[PDB]
């Protein structure tokens, strides 16, 4: 009856304990949504509105993440933002992640900051975009947008790399954008490194397809 999962989880930034509440869809209470309150008392006593109430139907992607600060993140990607919650363990991270999918496209999704360097300036793709990875392509979807600015084939990426909290993608002449690099900033060197390893692995995994 409404509440599927409940518990204290941390906000990745300020790292404050907030009491989260996952609720199933109902014809009275409202849609499937993830909410959080200042603490548990305010929820129990119905003495406050949730500080945030995110509908699951608006989340196009849900992933388990990690950075230099928080080892067990669970990230939600809607058309307008990236909402993350910091679990205290891999076990807890998976429970929430699993609960969310139980009530809720791309293999991976990363929110990045496309710099004006290289193809950034030449193709005018700067600011906040979402790097969406499949088994065969990488798309750059602008924040607040539902359609892709550009789709790159994994086959056309000559190389990719990272330096500090930056990550780049060099595409060959056979790419839709022509040759050039795509530079983008991320939270820290940890996430920049995972971005590199995951995409590279997806590049290498192509030789495994018959």
| Contact residues: a second copy, CB under 8 A | 155-159, 171-175, 179, 204-210
Alpha carbon of residue 56 to chain centroid: 14
- Nearest CB to a second copy, comparing residues 15 and 205: 205
Paired with 10 in beta bridges are 17, 86
- Nearest CB to a second copy, comparing residues 27 and 208: 208
Alpha carbon of residue 99 to chain centroid: 17
Report the nearest approach of a second copy to the CB of residue 132 (Å): 20
- Nearest CB to a second copy, comparing residues 3 and 205: 205
First to last CA, the chain: 48
Report the nearest approach of a second copy to the CB of residue 159 (Å): 6
Report the nearest approach of a second copy to the CB of residue 167 (Å): 17
Report the nearest approach of a second copy to the CB of residue 142 (Å): 24
**Whole-angstrom distance, CA of residue 190 vs CA of residue 185:** 12
- Nearest CB to a second copy, comparing residues 98 and 135: 135
- Nearest CB to a second copy, comparing residues 49 and 206: 206
Report the nearest approach of a second copy to the CB of residue 155 (Å): 6
**Whole-angstrom distance, CA of residue 67 vs CA of residue 74:** 11
**Whole-angstrom distance, CA of residue 37 vs CA of residue 172:** 49
Instruction: Find the largest Cα–Cα distance for the chain.
Output: 62
**Whole-angstrom distance, CA of residue 132 vs CA of residue 139:** 5
């Amino acid at each position: 009856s409404d509440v599927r999962k409940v518990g204290y989880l941390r906000k990745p930034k300020s790292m404050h304990k907030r009491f989260f509440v996952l609720r199933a869809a109902s014809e009275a209470g409202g849609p499937a949504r993830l909410e959080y309150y200042e603490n548990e008392k305010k929820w129990r006593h119905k003495s406050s509105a949730p500080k945030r109430s995110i509908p699951l139907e608006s989340c196009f992607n849900i992933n388990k993440r990690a950075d230099s600060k928080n080892k067990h993140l669970v990230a939600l990607y809607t058309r307008d933002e990236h909402f993350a919650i910091a679990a205290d363990s891999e076990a807890e991270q998976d429970s929430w992640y699993q609960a969310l999918l139980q009530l809720h496209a791309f293999k991976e999704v990363w929110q990045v900051i496309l710099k004006p360097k290289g193809l950034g300036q030449t193709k005018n793709l700067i600011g906040i975009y979402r790097l969406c990875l499949t088994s065969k392509t990488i798309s750059f979807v602008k924040l607040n947008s539902e359609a892709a600015a550009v789709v790159l084939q994994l086959m056309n990426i000559r190389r990719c790399g990272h330096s500090e909290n930056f990550f780049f993608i060099e595409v060959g002449r056979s790419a839709v954008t022509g040759p050039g690099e795509f530079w983008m900033q991320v939270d820290d060197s940890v996430v920049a490194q995972n971005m590199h390893e995951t995409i590279l692995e997806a590049m290498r995994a192509m030789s495994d397809e018959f």
